[PDB]
């Protein structure tokens, strides 16, 4: 088979992980969709020239077992930690994600990317300053993003296949 990408969406909820996941996948902005609802979506895409395939996880937070998000944690190669630019809270709670994730995968290398979402709204409590700040402490890349225009997602995506290539060819 082509080439598969597992990418896994994480974030406090409302911040437009299944906005975010459905724009990538089908190119429309579902504006509402229930929080509760966790579930994979697959795209065939061109990645500099990569025919592959995008198995993504659009999570929505506890499980009923923590084992099955350790199972997809394990399972995931990267992460996309969206927080919202109009919501300090969920941007705090990036702290806990990364430290979730590096955790279970017993990994100090796991390919993420930091997703401020929500960009085309003119209120703003996350400056692009602070956000790169903890993107640099990471030592990942940053990406603002609309789901709602569309604007920065297919960057968010492929920025975190190419991470995924990075850490794939130590
Ligand atoms: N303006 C705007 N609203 C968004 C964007 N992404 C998501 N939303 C809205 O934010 C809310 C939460 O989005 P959702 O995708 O359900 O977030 P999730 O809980 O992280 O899956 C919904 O009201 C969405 O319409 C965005 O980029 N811009
Ligand atoms: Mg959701």
Sequence with gaps: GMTEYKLVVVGAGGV????LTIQLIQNHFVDEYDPTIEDSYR?????????CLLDILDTAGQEE????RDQYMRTGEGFLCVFAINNTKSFEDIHHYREQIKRVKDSEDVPMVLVGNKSDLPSRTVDTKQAQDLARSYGIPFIETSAKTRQGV???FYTLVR????????
């Design 43 to 51: 795209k065939q895409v061109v990645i500099d020239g990569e025919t």
């Design 65 to 68: 077992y923590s084992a099955m």
């Design 154 to 156: 297919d960057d968010a």
């Design 16 to 19: 437009g992980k299944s906005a």
């Design 163 to 170: 991470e995924i290539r990075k850490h794939k060819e130590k």
